[PDB]
Amino acid sequence: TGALVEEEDPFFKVPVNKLAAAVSNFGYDLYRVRSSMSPTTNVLLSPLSVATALSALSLGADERTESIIHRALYYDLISSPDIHGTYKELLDTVTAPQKNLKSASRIVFEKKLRIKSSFVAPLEKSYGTRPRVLTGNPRLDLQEINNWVQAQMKGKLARSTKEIPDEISILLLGVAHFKGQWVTKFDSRKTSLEDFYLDEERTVRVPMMSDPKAVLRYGLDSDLSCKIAQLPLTGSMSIIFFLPLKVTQNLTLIEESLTSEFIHDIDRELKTVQAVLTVPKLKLSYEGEVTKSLQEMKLQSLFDSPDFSKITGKPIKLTQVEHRAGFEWNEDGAGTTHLTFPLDYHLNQPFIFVLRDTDTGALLFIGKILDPRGP
Ligand SMILES: *[C@@H]1O[C@H](CO)[C@@H](O)[C@H](O)[C@H]1NC(C)=O
């Protein structure tokens, strides 16, 4: 509907979960915009790091500009204050050691700019991050950033070398990395090269992990025309696979459904079954700019002439938003485990997976896998 009312599903009535649903819904919008731009390539995305940079920035923004941002983050549908106080919490929860997610955001400003401490104060408190002011020296500024996303990602992300843009006003950076563990490991001796249908005309061989007697939560959505399965990870997390029925690169109907609320129903409507599971080994990375995506996400106003007078007196505008993500999984797990039910779940064709946090329900990672072999 779109109007302000009180929450019903007890899950979203919790403030931190409510905030996670908004930020996550922003993630889904971004994914949909980006998937539309990359019709033939894998899409790896960890929206949280980017959503956090926007929300942090919105601190030194004024009414009109702030709203533009708040509306893209679904905050205007949250009838609760201390939205930043809650964000501090959410972050504390999903970045905890037990999870295996490392997510960081950074606001970078143009050379010689002077930032009002009234802005730095709220920012460092709620988001635990200080703004970096560019040096002007191209080689020195790029070193700084790389060392930053290095100390942050504990050196699990490829040190970039794209050379910061000549023209920079405000730069937002969102980096994230993930290497987790299933509650049940896979037999490394059961992993073999198998056929992966890239599409109806092309096939390739990628190493596939296997478990002929896997216990996962399953469900078939007749409308979307796909098979949904959920595998748990240690640290109270899960991965949801959306496997279409026929081989295809067209996953639109499905993508169009991805929302926080939709995922909550699927999570509960799922039934535990036993299945023959084969999932490809995955090790992916992505380093790009999502500025063009945000531009057609009702966020153009920020690249034009926004009002950030709460940050500085000089007119500054959102110039670029960069994202660096690294995702990976394999056999590593925690431990192991009349009349049955048949069930095949073979991920040997284009699919979409969603790494979600079980406690808050926050979207930690999303990917459209057209080719396991990676970029
Ligand atoms: C994707 O498949 C659906 C269902 O067959 C179809 O309606 C849609 O047109 C396809 N995507 C296109 C045509 O861009």
Topology overview:
Elements (H helix, E strand, L loop, with lengths): L9 H4 L1 H23 L5 E3 L2 H10 L5 H10 L10 H12 L6 E9 L7 H11 L4 E2 L4 H15 L17 E10 L2 E3 L7 E6 L5 E19 L4 E8 L3 E8 L7 H4 L4 H10 L1 E10 L1 E8 L1 H9 L1 H4 L13 E12 L3 E3 L8 E3 L4 E7 L5 E7 L6
Parallel strand pairs: 2-3, 4-12, 5-13, 10-14
Antiparallel strand pairs: 1-16, 2-4, 6-7, 7-8, 7-10, 8-9, 9-15, 11-12, 15-16
Helix pairs in contact: 2-5, 2-10
The chain binds 2-acetamido-2-deoxy-beta-D-glucopyranose.
Overview of the molecule:
It contains eleven helices and 16 strands. With 375 residues, it is of the alpha+beta class. The chain has two domains: 169 residues, Alpha-1-antitrypsin, domain 1, CATH 2.30.39.10; 206 residues, Antithrombin, Chain I, domain 2 (2-Layer Sandwich), CATH 3.30.497. Strands 1, 6, 7, 8, 9, 10, 14, 15 and 16 form a nine-stranded mixed sheet that branches. The longest helix is centred in the N-terminal third of the chain and has 23 residues. Bound molecules: 2-acetamido-2-deoxy-beta-D-glucopyranose. This is Pigment epithelium-derived factor. It is found in: Secreted; Melanosome.
Short description:
The PDB classes it as signaling protein. The chain has 375 residues and is an alpha+beta fold. It contains 11 helices and 16 strands.
Which structural traits does this protein have?
375 residues, alpha+beta, Alpha-1-antitrypsin, domain 1, Antithrombin, Chain I, domain 2, nine-stranded mixed beta sheet, five-stranded mixed beta sheet, 11 helices, 16 strands, 30% helix, binds 2-acetamido-2-deoxy-beta-D-glucopyranose, signaling protein, serpin, pedf
